[PDB]
Design a protein around this nucleic acid. Structure first.
Ligand SMILES: [Mg+2]
Ligand SMILES: [Mg+2]
Ligand SMILES: [Mg+2]
Ligand SMILES: [Mg+2]
Ligand SMILES: [Mg+2]
Ligand SMILES: [Mg+2]
Ligand SMILES: [Mg+2]
Ligand SMILES: [Mg+2]
Ligand SMILES: [Mg+2]
Ligand SMILES: [Mg+2]
Ligand SMILES: [Mg+2]
Ligand SMILES: [Mg+2]
Ligand SMILES: [Mg+2]
Ligand SMILES: [Mg+2]
Ligand SMILES: [Mg+2]
Ligand SMILES: [Mg+2]
Ligand SMILES: [Mg+2]
Ligand SMILES: [Mg+2]
Ligand SMILES: [Mg+2]
Ligand SMILES: [Mg+2]
Ligand SMILES: [Mg+2]
Ligand SMILES: [Mg+2]
Ligand SMILES: [Mg+2]
Ligand SMILES: [Mg+2]
Ligand SMILES: [Mg+2]
Ligand SMILES: [Mg+2]
Ligand SMILES: [Mg+2]
Lengths: 402, 131, 225
RNA sequence: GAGAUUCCCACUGUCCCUACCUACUAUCCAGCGAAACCACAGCCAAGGGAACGGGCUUGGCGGAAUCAGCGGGGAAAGAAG
RNA sequence: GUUCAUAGCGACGUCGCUUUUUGAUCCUUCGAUGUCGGCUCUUCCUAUCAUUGUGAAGCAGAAUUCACCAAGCGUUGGAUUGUUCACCCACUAAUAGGGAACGUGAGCUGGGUUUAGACCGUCGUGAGACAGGUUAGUUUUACCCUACUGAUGAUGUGUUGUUGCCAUGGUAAUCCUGCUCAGUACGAGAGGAACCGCAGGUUCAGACAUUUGGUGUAUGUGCUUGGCUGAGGAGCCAAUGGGGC
């Protein structure tokens, strides 16, 4: 008989293999459709989830309650040191799908990049690409490389560049760089090969890939929660307190017929560490990173047009469980999948952004830099020392400091 | 124009809130909330600025055994106000109105939430203060 | 002359405007059909400012002004205070009072020369009225009703009052303000006069639902056209 | 009155609507080590059939060895209703 | 149906479909297939309540009614009752109807029926009986096979790694309100829309912890009861002593 009252289904069947992701990086799975009329550009980037904070800005949404008003909005900081291009892949269109046609790797592959090719770097002889790089010098190898480029030019439909991150610039323990194929869009195959060939061994900063106040897609793996039951995994209703063999369960897992448990019934297992793709994440700010012209510049990270405070994006006492952010960063609006220091893929939007939520100019008034390691109440060190005055440890130090 | 943003409700069906107007009613017993489609097992809940159906449990005897439209003007549950302000009141209070939105009474004791005042101009006129 | 108007299909146009002989505050959430009626029917000289207070549109109930001065309540942001200042003629001075009874239009009404006030105004704010609105503050309210501001609208030529005022309170009132007060309604039966109407000395805006018969009394008492 | 019932105040996670923590388990390991049950066994749809098949017919198909769970089936077990 | 059989209905007759009613039968089960309802949860049907696109009217507008494609999505919160049904309150776009061993008890519960105690009414000489009422009454086992959920692995490419492609399977978004259009079209009047546009919400989904809240044995830091170390200081025990943050 029919269930007595209608209720919507718990959870989505569009994410059914609710399993641990087979990858840790998070792959793009769909690059923006290429049109030759556009200029040659990259479509993706790799960043690392540093942490969250909130900002104050004025909204320019006419007809809204918050028009010309101040709002406080949570943001996510994604540290994005420049990518290094080390290779080019060409793909050819076949009636069986895209297939890899030819791959050409640059000379002088970085040491952190070469770590990706080894499961045990410590015991390795570091021999990877040692014989390959020799063919960039002799004329016989150089002729073969030119044929590989010419063959890519006349046969391939889409080309991609292999780019890796720079572990030495991050406060993380991992020294193994993250490799990634980033599709090159916007031109003829000959033009994008010439463009990519100039970028070999070069650094591509994030401001060359993405821009201010544009909406991108974030691809990554969510936080792992381990083995979970149906109440936490599928958010089903808890059974009453009087239930004998347990109440954090699903009471009926199917009718007598079809005499099997259907794939659509909520059951316990892995929760979290799933590959997810969130679209429409606006870029509130692209931070400029630390410089040294005469002294170290940090103002270009958290000072606004209305703050004018010499402070960086780093909270007081540092980002919790991440470290200190010293490179370029992207300030995304809202939350982003993954733990701290989880590698994230930023991808250009596959859609056309025409709504007024998109194409809206973002002008920050304030960036919060209070300590996130507790209920922080001070934006900067200097503000805290001015408020509290000298302390006992300052006195005993100044006593020794004469 | 501009519509009301979502706020934390905190007043399900069966909550007894204070009656802040001079109608002689002392409390309002919420029996349903206007505009609630529903969900299996979910109680219809209201925040400030929400029109509710309420009966007065104590007060003048000519108001008791009836159903009155009412609007929540204060709530004890904290709610975010789109500028990072989490505001809550000392008590849950509401006033008795009609379906058109004007009050049966003529004065309001205590503050009225800004979310309720903007959405109901007849309530806002009788408000001593808007918080 | 009584023009009818509505803010966003709401007749309570006393909630969404403040007219004084010199400036006209109008609420922000609106849309031409309302702003016009002001700018149109207003006497060219008197600027029309789109304002808010605390973010809200009920600015007429949150604000008390005459030709001399505007008092805005403690919840007024300084982005707002500034924009009211940088829009009004610098005769009118703006002070952001700090009164427990924020609803300054519900709790005080003033023409160019007197103000009725609600019993419980802070003495402090009694002074900041009679020092900014160059007025003679008079803590008096009708029988029972303490929200003077909302139940009694007055100009410098006449004044309306809640229909349920006594002939005797009428009497006394019409002393203090030395203006002829008529008991009346607006928006077809509404006691809350101030909620329904905004008056100048040369113009009056009432809500779209004001009966002709009322429209008349308005004209008459306000000694308009 | 550890009797049956109805209402009210107070009270509360009974509930909205679930979350987190603690102990002991479960879990993995060293040692030790049962029992119930067992025609053969064990993926489905329809057909026909003792009129609800694991086996048969026709089709869908089918890839070693396993771990933690689970309660849809085995018209599961328990007892010559 | 003011006229007008067929906008919408349909007497007298007459042809069917369905197996969500109750019968009829007794084919399977009596070396037992756990017997009502509710809860939970999934899926399916369409004879469509709402929503999308439409045709018709005794369709001026608004509202409503009939029919088509159509099951994608939704169809609620409560008082009484064990109830299924029923009825009322209220919200709503709508509060449509059904199947799956009258889905679902090694999922629960045990209010009902249906053991043994007991009371009443009626019946019986009596023991006792009552699709009469009432009260109290043990709900056992999974570690096996499969199914399903997750987790290692396996075949082949000489070994091993990096980056990838996509066969195939799943699949997701939904509905409402306000402003404007517009007191406009239409209408004698009363009333009274819609397309574009804007601002928001409901249900659902996937996340996340900057903020607010919850937790808190960091057994972190104060406070505190009883006891104990001769006292101070420093601590400990009271199955987390209690409590604040
Ligand atoms: Mg149904
Ligand atoms: Mg039990
Ligand atoms: Mg923190
Ligand atoms: Mg329920
Ligand atoms: Mg079968
Ligand atoms: Mg027998
Ligand atoms: Mg026997
Ligand atoms: Mg006829
Ligand atoms: Mg037989
Ligand atoms: Mg059995
Ligand atoms: Mg069985
Ligand atoms: Mg049909
Ligand atoms: Mg059954
Ligand atoms: Mg069962
Ligand atoms: Mg059982
Ligand atoms: Mg019983
Ligand atoms: Mg018995
Ligand atoms: Mg007898
Ligand atoms: Mg007993
Ligand atoms: Mg085990
Ligand atoms: Mg597919
Ligand atoms: Mg679906
Ligand atoms: Mg002690
Ligand atoms: Mg001591
Ligand atoms: Mg001891
Ligand atoms: Mg003891
Ligand atoms: Mg606490």
């Amino acid at each position: 008989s029919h269930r007595k009252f209608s209720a919507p289904r718990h959870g989505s069947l569009g994410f059914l293999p609710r399993k641990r992701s087979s990858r840790h990086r998070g792959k793009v799975k769909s690059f923006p459709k290429d049109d030759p009329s556009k200029p040659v550009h990259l479509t993706a980037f790799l960043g690392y989830k540093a942490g969250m904070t909130h900002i104050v800005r004025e909204v320019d949404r006419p007809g809204s309650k918050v028009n010309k008003k101040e709002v406080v909005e949570a943001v996510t900081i994604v540290e994005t040191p420049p990518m290094v291009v080390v290779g080019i892949v060409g793909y050819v269109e076949t009636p069986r799908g895209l297939r890899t046609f030819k791959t050409v790797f640059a000379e002088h592959i970085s040491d952190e990049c070469k770590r990706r090719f080894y499961k045990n770097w410590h015991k390795s002889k570091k021999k990877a690409f040692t014989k390959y790089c020799k063919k960039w010098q002799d004329e016989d190898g150089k002729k073969q490389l030119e044929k590989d480029f010419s063959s890519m030019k006349k046969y391939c439909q889409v080309i991609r560049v292999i780019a890796h991150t720079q572990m030495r610039l991050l406060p993380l323990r991992q020294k193994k760089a993250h490799l990634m194929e980033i599709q090159v869009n916007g031109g003829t195959v000959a033009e994008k090969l010439d463009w990519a060939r100039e970028r070999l061994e070069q650094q591509v900063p994030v401001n060359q890939v993405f821009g201010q106040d544009e909406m991108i897609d974030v691809i990554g793996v969510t936080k792992g929660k381990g083995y979970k039951g149906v109440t936490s995994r599928w958010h089903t209703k808890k059974l009453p307190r009087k239930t004998h063999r347990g109440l954090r369960k699903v009471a009926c897992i199917g009718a007598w017929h079809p005499a099997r448990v259907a794939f659509s019934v909520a059951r316990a297992g892995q929760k979290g560490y799933h590959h997810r793709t969130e679209i429409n994440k606006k870029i509130y700010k692209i931070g400029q990173g630390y410089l040294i012209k005469d002294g170290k510049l940090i103002k270009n990270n958290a000072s606004t047009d209305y703050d004018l405070s010499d402070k960086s994006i780093n909270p007081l006492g540092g980002f919790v469980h991440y470290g200190e952010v010293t490179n370029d960063f992207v300030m995304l609006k809202g939350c982003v999948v993954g733990t701290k220091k989880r590698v994230l893929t930023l991808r250009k939007s596959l859609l056309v952004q025409t709504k007024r939520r998109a194409l809206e100019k973002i002008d920050l008034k304030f960036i919060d830099t209070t300590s996130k390691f507790g209920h922080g109440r001070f934006q900067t060190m200097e503000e805290k020392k001015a408020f509290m005055g000298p302390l006992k440890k300052d006195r005993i130090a100044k006593e020794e400091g004469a | 124009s501009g519509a009301k943003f979502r706020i934390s409700l905190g007043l399900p069906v069966g909550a007894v809130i204070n009656c802040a107007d001079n109608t002689g009613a002392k409390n309002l017993y919420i029996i349903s909330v206007k505009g609630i489609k529903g969900r299996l097992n979910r109680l219809p809940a209201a925040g400030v600025g929400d029109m509710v159906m309420a009966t007065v449990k104590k007060g003048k005897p000519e108001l008791r055994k009836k159903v009155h439209p009412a609007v929540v003007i204060r709530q004890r549950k904290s709610y975010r106000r789109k500028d990072g302000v989490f505001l809550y009141f000392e008590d849950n209070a509401g006033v008795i109105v009609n379906n058109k939105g004007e009050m049966k009474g003529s004065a309001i004791t205590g503050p009225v939430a800004k979310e309720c005042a903007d959405l109901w101009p007849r309530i806002a006129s009788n408000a001593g203060s808007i918080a | 002359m009584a023009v009818r108007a509505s803010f966003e299909n709401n007749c309570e146009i006393g909630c969404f405007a403040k007219l004084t002989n010199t400036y006209c505050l109008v609420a922000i959430g609106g849309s031409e059909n309302f702003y016009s009626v002001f700018e149109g029917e207003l006497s060219d000289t008197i600027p029309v400012v789109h304002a808010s207070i605390a973010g809200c549109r009920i600015i007429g109930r949150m604000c008390v002004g005459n030709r001399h001065g505007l008092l805005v309540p403690n919840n007024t942001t300084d982005q707002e205070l500034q924009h009211i200042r940088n829009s009004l003629p610098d005769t009118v001075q703006i002070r952001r009072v700090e009164e427990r009874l924020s609803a300054l239009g519900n709790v005080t009404t003033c023409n160019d020369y007197v103000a009725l006030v609600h019993p419980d105004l802070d003495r402090e704010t009694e002074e900041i009225l009679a020092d900014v609105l160059k007025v003679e503050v008079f803590r008096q309210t009708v029988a029972d009703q303490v929200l003077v501001g909302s139940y009694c609208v007055f100009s410098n030529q006449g004044g309306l009052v809640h229909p349920k005022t006594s002939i005797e309170d009428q009497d006394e009132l019409s002393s203090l303000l030395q203006v002829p007060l008529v008991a009346g309604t607006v928006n077809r039966g509404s006691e809350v006069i101030a909620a329904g109407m905004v008056v100048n000395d040369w113009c009056a805006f009432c809500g779209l639902d004001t009966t002709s018969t009322e429209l008349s009394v308005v004209e008459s008492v306000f000694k308009l056209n």
